[PDB]
Amino acid sequence: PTHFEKRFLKRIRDLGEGHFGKVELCRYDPEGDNTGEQVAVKSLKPNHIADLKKEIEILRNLYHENIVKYKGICTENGIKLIMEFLPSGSLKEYLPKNKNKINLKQQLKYAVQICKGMDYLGSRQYVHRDLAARNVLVESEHQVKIGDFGLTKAIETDKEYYTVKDDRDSPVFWYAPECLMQSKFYIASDVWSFGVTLHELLTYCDSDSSPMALFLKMIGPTHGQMTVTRLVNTLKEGKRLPCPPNCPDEVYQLMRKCWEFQPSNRTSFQNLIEGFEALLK
Numbered sequence: 438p439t440h441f442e443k444r445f446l447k448r449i450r451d452l453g454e455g456h457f458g459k460v461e462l463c464r465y466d467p468e469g470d471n472t473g474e475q476v477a478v479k480s481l482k483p484n485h486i487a488d489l490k491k492e493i494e495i496l497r498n499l500y501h502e503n504i505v506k507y508k509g510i511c512t513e514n515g516i517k518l519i520m521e522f523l524p525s526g527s528l529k530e531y532l533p534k535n536k537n538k539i540n541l542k543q544q545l546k547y548a549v550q551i552c553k554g555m556d557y558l559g560s561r562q563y564v565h566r567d568l569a570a571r572n573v574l575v576e577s578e579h580q581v582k583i584g585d586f587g588l589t590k591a592i593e594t595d596k597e598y599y600t601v602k603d604d605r606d607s608p609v610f611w612y613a614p615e616c617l618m619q620s621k622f623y624i625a626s627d628v629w630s631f632g633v634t635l636h637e638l639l640t641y642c643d644s645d646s647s648p649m650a651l652f653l654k655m656i657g658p659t660h661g662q663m664t665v666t667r668l669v670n671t672l673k674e675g676k677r678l679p680c681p682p683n684c685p686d687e688v689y690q691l692m693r694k695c696w697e698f699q700p701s702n703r704t705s706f707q708n709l710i711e712g713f714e715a716l717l718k
């Protein structure tokens with residue numbers, strides 16, 4: 438029922454890569470009549486296996502309207518994560534093709550959807566650690582879902598954060614100062630990355646208005662080594678990504694709330710929900 442044979446997992450096209458993971462469009466066709474359903478299959482990049490095995494345990498224990506649905510596993514030593522395929526892709530591929538279709542009312546509805554999904558993650562005691570628009574999938578012009586949990590970690594009961602040990606290649610331009618300074622990840626660290634994802638959403642994911650592109654015009658040339666140190670100084674000086682063009686005061690003021698230096702001063706995901714919903718008539 439929840440098992441998927443590798444032989445029936447017919448490879449169609451690549452969907453996204455990482456550094457220890459890759460995602461493909463496959464059709465699970467055990468009848469062989471080409472009538473099976475299209476699925477997304479996450480597997481290891483040619484270890485690292487227990488990392489994906491821990492991701493399976495997380496997505497299996499997740500059931501929400503705004504979280505990509507778990508379908509099952511394909512075992513080989515190796516293992517694959519089988520989920521629902523969302524043909525529109527992520528916001529990164531969707532938004533630049535729909536600048537005319539997606540208005541402020543719609544982006545606000547995506548914000549609510551990203552927040553409800555994130556809040557449900559917070560309730561299950563997890564920290565996402567990779568909240569970016571590239572990981573927010575479009576189900577329709579009305580529905581979005583969180584599509585990757587590759588750096589998601591469980592917060593120890595009664596503890597407020599998770600401390601990352603290794604952290605080989607994390608999205609530093611989406612990171613709060615606690616993460617950059619102490620390798621500590623709170624639910625409030627996820628809030629900050631939402632603010633950044635929101636900025637991307639408001640800029641229709643315009644490539645040259647991305648957090649990386651903009652922060653490197655405030656920091657300048659740096660390379661891997663110094664990137665984080667200069668990033669911390671910028672944020673220490675109160676500097677933040679500016680209000681996107683056409684963004685109203687009310688929305689940017691909710692975005693600024695995610696970006697309070699101290700984890701304890703930042704807004705919650707439930708407050709963002711109520712906050713955005715109040716702007717939707």
Ligand SMILES: Cn1cc(Nc2nccc(N3C[C@H]4CC[C@@H](C3)N4C(=O)[C@@H]3CC3(F)F)n2)cn1
Pocket residue numbers: 452453454455458459460477479505520521522523524525526527530571572573574584585587
């Ligand atoms: C371009 N495109 C994608 C679809 N559909 C679709 N349905 C479900 C998941 C999914 N994901 C791709 C991306 C976004 C989230 C995660 C799964 N992917 C990754 O890149 C992970 C990091 C890693 F490669 F493992 N993509 C359609 N066009």
